[PDB]
């Protein structure tokens, strides 16, 4: 019976003396006792099923957060917190929802419900500042106990939620990687007990994974929309944070005056003289440029901008590369936003795009993802298949697009487009993209021709024009 049972720590492992012989592990591996990774503590179901239990004799009895107030979440979010009360730590650990519908609120509520000494992990200071703005109803004495805790200073019991910090490892004054042995954990190194991760996909990377791996970490919650990069690490995240409690929030459940119905499309474009000579012959990182700048595909992108500006729709055009961004945008004479555009000029372009009926198309680089207030529109065009994550295409779509007036309860009232060059490595991403979006509940189709592109003025009207671009791209 476990009334005497010691349990300890060695470098990243838990060893269990004079044992109760617990299920699901090897025995006398190198001594009479059981020995697991720290990170295996998460598997509380394997003892719970057996009817086994354990005690935290290493406890520290100091004080904790109360945060008694409540607020109102979206109908699935409320169902998602209600499930978490239901399931408990044996059968909980991540939630997936867009970066534009209430993820900050799920984190402050997840900490106010769970109610333990908490450390909040985030990607960015702007997102700490959005959390703070969310959290003001549960903030103790409004503004006299909230503080930041990162590379310049630390103070107070709370802040953006409870104490927030960043994932970073540049040196001793990062935030979470450097401190990962001092505080956290109620069961050993026992100052705190609860972990809330915003942007949770960020942690399972090869160096970062160690922050999570080198503890027992009792309660853990993660929140994300991108969830994984193109190589799919996500089997690891079940171990590292916990299993996935929720994924859906389909626009099928929020149509009539609520968000958008999006017609999704992929566009297959043919390939014009000289560009495949050179695509086929070049194996280097330049070849990404011959498939993206393919003038038949540029003419589809131009025709599509013309069609939605003629109807006065608002359009964001995404370009994965600053070269591509500027070659498309300067030719189409639409503003662009990227790293080196200053804040003053970005807030002028974005205010113009949202309020001015003359400024209806803009071009944007990778800087929109990860802590950025992308504006509203009704049309999204991606010039390329990229290598950022099929799941980030759906986060980006979801956070940017809304219903056009009048038509707020129809089958579709917003539009997404991804442009693909036929007979290239750009095509490989489609059978995955297509399966992903339809599994996310989206109506998605393939458009393979445009015989009305043969009825109007567009660029690249000759071989000589196309040759002028081909020489510039090759250089």
């Amino acid at each position: 019976i476990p009334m005497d049972l010691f349990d300890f720590y060695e470098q990243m492992d838990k060893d269990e003396e004079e044992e109760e012989e617990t299920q699901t592990v090897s025995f006398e591996v190198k001594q009479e006792m059981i020995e697991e990774l720290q990170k295996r503590c998460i598997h509380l179901e394997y003892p719970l099923l057996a009817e086994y239990d354990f005690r935290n004799d290493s406890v520290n009895p100091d004080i904790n957060i109360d945060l008694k107030p409540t607020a109102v979440l979206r109908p699935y979010q409320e169902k998602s917190l209600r499930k978490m009360f239901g399931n408990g730590r044996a059968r909980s650990g991540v939630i997936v929802l867009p970066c534009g519908a209430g993820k900050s609120l799920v984190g402050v509520t997840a900490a106010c419900t769970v109610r333990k000494r908490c450390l909040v992990l985030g990607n960015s200071a702007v997102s700490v500042e959005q959390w703070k703005a969310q959290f003001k109803m549960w903030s103790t004495i409004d503004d006299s106990q909230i503080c930041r805790f990162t590379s310049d200073a630390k103070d107070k019991p709370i802040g953006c939620s409870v104490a927030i910090s960043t994932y970073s490892m540049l040196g001793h004054t990062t935030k979470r990687s450097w401190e990962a042995e001092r505080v956290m954990e109620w069961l050993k190194t026992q100052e705190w007990g609860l972990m809330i991760l915003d942007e949770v996909h960020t942690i399972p990377a090869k160096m970062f994974r160690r922050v999570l791996t080198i503890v027992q970490a009792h309660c853990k919650l993660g929140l994300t929309a991108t969830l994984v990069r193109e190589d799919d690490k996500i089997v690891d995240l079940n171990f590292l944070i916990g299993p996935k409690l929720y994924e859906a929030n389909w626009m099928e459940l929020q149509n009539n005056g609520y968000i958008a119905k999006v017609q999704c499309a992929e566009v297959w474009c043919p390939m014009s003289p000289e560009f495949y000579r050179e695509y086929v012959a070049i194996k280097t990182k330049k070849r990404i440029l011959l498939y993206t700048m393919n003038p038949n595909k540029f003419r589809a992108c131009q025709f599509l901008i013309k069609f939605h500006e003629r109807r006065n729709d608002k359009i964001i055009v995404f370009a994965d590369n600053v070269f591509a961004l500027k070659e498309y945008a300067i030719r189409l004479n639409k503003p662009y936003i990227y790293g080196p555009t200053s804040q003053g000029e970005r807030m002028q372009i974005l205010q113009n795009f949202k309020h001015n009926p003359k400024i209806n198309t803009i071009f944007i680089s990778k800087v929109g993802d990860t802590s950025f207030d992308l504006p509203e529109a009704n049309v999204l065009i991606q010039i390329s298949s990229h290598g950022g994550s099929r799941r980030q295409e759906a986060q980006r779509l979801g956070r940017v697009l809304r219903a056009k007036k009048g038509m707020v309860a129809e089958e579709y009232n917003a539009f997404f487009y991804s442009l693909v060059s036929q007979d290239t490595q750009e095509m490989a991403y489609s059978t995955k993209r297509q399966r992903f979006l339809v599994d996310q509940g989206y109506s998605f189709k393939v458009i393979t021709k445009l015989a009305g592109m043969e009825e109007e003025d567009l660029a690249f009207s000759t071989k000589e024009e196309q040759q002028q671009l081909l020489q510039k791209v090759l250089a």
Binding site: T70, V72, L73, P75, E78, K79, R82
Partner: protein, 152 residues
């Protein structure tokens, strides 16, 4: 007697005597009657704490004012809304005559306030029996203690 009294105990409690008991009518099936309760439907429907129901504006505005309007507009029949006091009644229905500009029901109902008059009471019952939602016993507000309890 009092019509119903089946749990029996309160009368012997009040008397400090133990009468002979008897149930002395044949009753009809439960299905002709329906006795609902309302409190909310989703997990975000938190405005009904009623720690100070006489002061909780958000609670009066939310399902107390809003559920009444949903139920009355959907179920279009002659329906009387009973209240615990005049002050609640006045706050819940903005009416033609509002206690504030900030009150949360907009729909044709009739009032039943103090200085009721025996002749004036009948006018309101003539209106409710004749037609429309509104009248005495119809889409009208009355405090439960008040005269409407005599009925017609």
């Amino acid at each position: 007697t009092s019509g119903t009294l089946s749990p029996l105990d309160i009368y012997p409690k009040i008397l400090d005597f133990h009468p002979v008991t008897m149930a002395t009518f044949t009753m009809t099936l439960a299905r002709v009657c329906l006795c609902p309760m309302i409190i909310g439907r989703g997990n975000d429907q938190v405005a009904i704490s009623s720690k100070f129901e006489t002061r909780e504006d958000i609670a009066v505005i939310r399902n107390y004012g809003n559920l009444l309007l949903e139920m009355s507009a959907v179920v279009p029949d002659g329906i009387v809304a009973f209240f615990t006091s005049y002050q609640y009644m006045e706050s819940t229905v903005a009416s033609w005559y509002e206690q504030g500009i900030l009150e949360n029901i907009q729909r044709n109902k009739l009032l039943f306030i103090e200085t009721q008059d025996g002749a004036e009471t009948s006018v309101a019952l003539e209106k409710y029996q004749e037609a429309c939602e509104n009248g005495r016993g119809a889409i009208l507000l009355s405090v439960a203690r008040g005269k409407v309890s005599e009925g017609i």
